[model samples]
Target: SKVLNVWAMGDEAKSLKELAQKFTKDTGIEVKVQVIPWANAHDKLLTAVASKSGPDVVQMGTTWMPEFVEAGALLDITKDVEKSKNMNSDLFFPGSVKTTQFDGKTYGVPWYAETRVLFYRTDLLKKVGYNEAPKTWDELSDAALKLSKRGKDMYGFAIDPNEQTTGFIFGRQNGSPLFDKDGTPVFNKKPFVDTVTYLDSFIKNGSAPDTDLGLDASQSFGGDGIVPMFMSGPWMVNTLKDTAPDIDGKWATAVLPKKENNESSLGGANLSIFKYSNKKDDALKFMDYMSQPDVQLSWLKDTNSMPARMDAWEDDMLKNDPYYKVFGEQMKTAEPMPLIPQFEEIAQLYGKSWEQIYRGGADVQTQMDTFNDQVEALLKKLEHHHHH
Candidate 1:
C-alpha cells in the first residue's frame, strides 16, 4: 500500500497517529505520522519543504495558515472541499473557516477550535453586587473595582496587555478589524485606539493587577480570591478541575463583555495538504473524514479540544456542563485574526504599543501615533511585494 505522510505538533501528533490507524483500517491507505515538538515544528517544516521532502498532510496553527500559503507550500483545496458532501464551509464556525483561507483561496481546514470567555468566581461576583458576570465594559469595570476591594492584595481581573488575543478581542468588540479587506494594516483605527485606553485604565485604577506576564491563572484563581476573574478557553476547565477541585460550584464562565455585542478571538490547529504531496486525493479523503461530526466528537473526547464543527457541540457532555456550554455560546461570536501573511509583524507592533503604555508609561496618543505611522509603512511594504 502506498503510504501517506502526516506531521502534527505536540501531543496532537500522537493522537493523529492513533486516529490514522482507524483511517487506514477504513480506507486501506497507510499513514506515516511524525509528531514534532511545537518549539521546533516551524523550523523543521521549513527545512522539510525546502528539501522537497515535506509530508503529504500537515497540522498547522490557525494563524500559520497564511504564512504557509504565502510560501507556496500548501495545496489550494477549495474545489476539493466544495465537492465533498461532508466538508462544506457552513458545517464549521465562520471564524474557523476563515482562518484556513487567504486571498479568497481555501488552503486548509480547521481541526479543532477554541475561544476565550470570562471565567469568574460566581460567589465573589455576587458579593460585589454583580449577580452575574459582566455584560458590558462599564459593568465589568464596576465588578472588578468592587471585587478588588474585598481583600488587600487580590485583584478582580488578570490583565495581560501583551496577549495578542486580548487586543483582537477588545478591538473586534469595539467594531474594528485589525486589517482592512485589502490586507492593509489598520491597527491604529479609532476602535483599537479606544480599546487600548480602556484596557490601560484597568491597570491605572488598580482594578486589575499591573503585571500578569508570568502569573499562573489556575493557581491564582483557585486560591484565596487572589484572581477572582479572568478570561480563558475550554482547556482551563480541566486545569481548574484538577488544580482546585474544591472550587467546583464557586466558578463559572460567561461571554466576554461587549461594546455592541460580544466578540471572541478564534484559535486552534488546522489541517492542510502540502503542494508537493503525491497523494492529494487520499489526503482530501482523510481531511473530509476528519471533518465529519462523529470524528470531531471523538476528537473532542480523546484530546479535550473543542470541536471545530458547529454541530459537534450537541454531544450531551458539552450541552450539560455549564462551563462548557458558555464556550459553545462564545464560539458563535468568535472571529479569526486577520488572515494575512504580514499579521505576525503587525501583531508584534500592536503588542509593543500596549507594552509601551503598560510598562514604559508611554502616553496613549504618542504610542498610537507611533504605531499608526509604523503600521502604515509596513502595509506599504507588504502591498509593494504582493503587487510587484
Candidate 2:
C-alpha cells in the first residue's frame, strides 16, 4: 500500500481530488491532493522542484510541460504510461496528446482540451443579412464592421487587447510561425502583422469600442449589447449560457477563420508527473486510472471542461451538441504553442508586442527585432543560470 501525493490547479484540483478519493476507496491506495492556484502554480512549482519538495503527481499546463521536462523535473513516464493497460495513444485526441511530447518523448497526459473559434450571435448575423459564417480574415472583418454601423455605440465584435491567446488564433490562421526552427521567437513576422491588422480594423473603423483596451474577453462578452461577436473557447460557452442563458441557442460558434491554409493555435493544459517523489509506481497506476473513458466523461458531465479523448466525445454529453462538433472540427486545425523553457518569459513580450502594433507604433521589423533580442537575452540567461 502506498500514499500518493498530488498537486492540481484551479477547479481541476477539486475535480481530481474527488477522482483520487474514489480511486483510493475502490483500489485501496492512499492519496493526498494539494490544490494550487493556476496563476501562481508555475513559479511555486519551480521553487518546490528546486527545493526537492515537489509532489508525486504534479498537474501542469501543457504549455509549461517543456519547462519541467527540460529541467529534468518530471518523470519520463513514456514507457510506463504506454505499458499500462489503461493508457494508450489511440485513447486521446492526437493534437492534445502531441502537446505533451517534447523532442519525441511524452511528458504529460492531456487532462482536458479546448480550441479557439468564432462565437457570433446568429440573430445579429441574420439581422445584418449574412446567413453563413465568414470564411476569411477580410470576410470576418466586414461582418463586424457591418454590425457596428447598424447601431450607435454598438460594435460588431469585441477583442481583448491584452489577450495574447487571441493573437495566436489570428497569427496561426495566417501561417505565422511564432518560433523559428531552432526554437527562437519570430513574433514580428508578416503573418503576425496580418493578425494585428485584422483586429485593428475593428478599433480603427469604430466597429469596436475605443476604450476596450482595459477590458478582457470575459468582461467584454459578459456585458450586454457592447460586444456582439467574440472569438473565444468553450469557457465562453459557460459564461454566455449561464450568466446570459436567455441567449442559449442565440450565440453560435464556428471554426476560426482560415487563410490559404486552414490553421489555428491549440491552447489547453495537460497533467504530468514530477520527478521529486518516490511513489513512481503508484503515480503510474493513478495516471493510468485517470485516463479511463468513464473518468473523462464524468469530468465533462460535471463541468465546462472538454474531454481530450475522441471516444469521450462520443459520449452524449458532447456529441449530441452541434456547438461541440464545431470544436472537434476546429481541433484538427490546431497547433501547439511554443514549447521552450523560456516560453513563460517570452509570453509577456508577445502581449507588449501586440499592444505596440495596436497603438500603430510598431512595424513587423522593429517589433520583431525587439522581441527577438529580448527573448534571446532571456534564453541565454536561463541557460547560463540553470543550465537549461
Candidate 3:
C-alpha cells in the first residue's frame, strides 16, 4: 500500500517505466518513476543522496556500485536477496555479481552486460585463404595485415587509439591487472607494454590507421566498413544497420585472440535499490519480478542487449542467433572491471598512461612508473577524503 518512487535515466528510464507500469498493473502497486538525462546523472544522484531526497529504487550502472556502497548510500541486500527464492547468484554472471559485492554483500543486480570481441569479415578471411578466425595475437595480426594488403584502401581493423575500452581489453587479455588492491598503478609492466606495442604496430604497419582522438570511435567503426574488423558491443547492430546495411551478414563475431588468458571489461548497466527507501519490500519484489526468466527474456527481446542471466540464453531467440551466441560465450568468461569506490577516477588516471604511451610517444616504462606514482597519490587522497 506504500507509494514507490523510482529513478532512472535516459532510455533506461523509459524501459524501466514500461516494465514498472506492467508490474503495478498486475500487482496493484502504485509507482512514480523519474528519468534524468545521462549527462546530468551523477550530479543529480549525488545531490539527491546528499540531501536525503533520493528515490526508493534506481537503475544504476554497475560501475557506480562500489562508489555509492562505499559512501553508505545503498542498502545492503545480502540477507534480503538470500531470503528471495526467485533471485539467486547462479542466475547472473559471476564477474558481474562480484562487482556488486562489498564486504561480501550484494548491493545490486545485474540488468545487462557488454563486452568487446573480434568482428571480422568472413568474406575477407576467405579471400585471404584463411578458413578460421585468428586464435592468437600472431594470427590476428597476420590476418589484419593480409586483409589490409588484399584491400589496400580498406583498413584491416578499427582501433580507436583514444578509446580506453580497446586499451583495457588488450591490457586485460595480456594478463595486466590494472592495479593492486591498494590502488597503485601497475599497467606499464611487460604485459601492458608488450600488448600496447602490439596495438601501436597496427597503425605503424598500415593495417589500422591512426585513431583520431577528436572523432568518436563509433563514427570510425560505422563508416562504410572502411575498417574491416572491429571490437564492438551489441548496440553496434543498430548503428551498423542504420548506417551500413550492406555490412550486416558479411560480419561475424568471435572471441578475442587468446593470450595467456581470455579477458573483457565487465561492461554493462545494473539495477540498484536505494538505502533511504521506505518501500524496500516493494522494490525487492519489483526487482525479483523483473529478474524472472520470462521478464529477462522480454528485456533481451526488446532491447538487443545480451542477457546477463545464463538461463535466458536457453530461449529460442538467443540459441538460434549466431551473433548472440558469440556474446553469450564471451559473457561466461568475462571479468568485472575494478570495484573500488575510486575506480572510475583511477581508471581515467591510468588511462592517461595508456594515452601517453599511444599518443605522446613516451617510453612505455617511464610512463608506467609515472602513472603508478600518480595512482598512489590519488588513492591516498581518496583515503584521506573518505576516512578523515
TM-score per candidate, chains pooled: 0.86, 0.87, 0.84
Cα shift from native, residue 337, model 2 (Å): 1.1
Q: Give lDDT tens digits, candidate 3, residues 1-388.
A: 3878887876657767888878999899988888887557767778977887688887776767788888788888888777766566667777877767778788888777777778777777777776777878888888888877855566777676444467667887888887755556667678876777888778778888764534343454444445667787776654555666555566677888888777776777777789888889889988887777777777666666777776777888788777778887777777766777776666666567767866677777787678767877877888788695
Q: Which candidate is the best by lDDT?
A: 1
Worst 10 residues of 2 by lDDT: 216-225
Q: Mark the regions of model 3 whose C-alpha exceeds 4 Å error after superposition.
A: 1-5, 9-13, 27-52, 147-153, 161-164, 180-184, 209-224, 238-243, 383-388
Q: Quantify how close model 1 is to the true structure by its C-alpha RMSD in Å.
A: 3.0
Residue range 1-388, candidate 1, lDDT tens digits? 3798888887667667877888999999988888898667767877877887788999987877787788898999988887776777777788888887777788888888888999899888988888888999999888988887777677888776556678778878887776778765556678878888888887877778887535566667876668888888777776677678767788888999989668888888889999989899999988887777776677576555688877777788878777677888888767777767766666778789888998788988779889878988986886788796
* Candidate 2: tens digits of C-alpha lDDT, residues 156-223: 87776655577666766677777768766566667776666777778788897656545544445544
Cα error of candidate 2 at position 19, Å? 2.1
lDDT of 1 at 363: 86
Model 2 lDDT on a 0 to 1 scale: 0.74
The per-prediction tally of clashing pairs is: 0, 0, 0
